[PDB]
Design a protein around this ligand. Structure first.
Ligand SMILES: COc1ccc(S(N)(=O)=O)cc1
Ligand SMILES: [Ca+2]
Ligand SMILES: [Ca+2]
Ligand SMILES: [Ca+2]
Ligand SMILES: [Zn+2]
Ligand SMILES: [Zn+2]
Length: 158
């Protein structure tokens, strides 16, 4: 499927979850992009205005695409594969409780997964992989991509 055909990728944070400190939202998203730029030729920059490649949105229920959210639990987030317009965009369910830690749903960990989709990755059948469909908390301070995630992303880039 689709991949970004350029090395400098931009992201924009459309709006901020009230569940977290603003600076923590910013850092969790930055860190999540870094996971992917660590293992590809990609470079990601936050822009504050105008059109980004990847728009990060928090929203609940019906929010203007074809992927209605479902309240607390169930689908936590979803994102669009590379492409123009909504392509690349990552949407986080406001009905989750977003956090920096193991409480609620960890924003960083979810963002690593969603950004994987934003870059062109589908789900992994390997429970060890970040791209495995089921959310399971792992220590964010020592987080590492599975071998499965690395071969997947490296099949698309670099
Ligand atoms: C690790 O990150 C995630 C993010 C989302 C989901 S899901 N498919 O909405 O339950 C699973 C894992
Ligand atoms: Ca949900
Ligand atoms: Ca986009
Ligand atoms: Ca919330
Ligand atoms: Zn959406
Ligand atoms: Zn997914």
């Amino acid at each position: 499927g689709p991949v970004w055909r350029k090395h400098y990728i931009t992201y924009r944070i459309n709006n901020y979850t009230p569940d977290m400190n603003r600076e923590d939202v910013d850092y969790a998203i930055r860190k999540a992009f870094q996971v992917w730029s660590n293992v590809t030729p990609l470079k990601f920059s936050k822009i504050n205005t105008g059109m980004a490649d990847i728009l990060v949105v928090f929203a609940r229920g019906a929010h203007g695409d074809d992927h209605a959210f479902d309240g607390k639990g169930g689908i936590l987030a979803h994102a669009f594969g590379p492409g123009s317009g909504i392509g690349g965009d990552a949407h986080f369910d406001e009905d989750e409780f977003w956090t920096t830690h193991s409480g609620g749903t960890n924003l960083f960990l979810t963002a690593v997964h969603e950004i994987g989709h934003s870059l062109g990755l589908g789900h992994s059948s390997d429970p060890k992989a970040v791209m495995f469909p089921t959310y399971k908390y792992v220590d964010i301070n020592t987080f590492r991509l599975s071998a499965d995630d690395i071969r997947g992303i490296q099949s698309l880039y670099g």
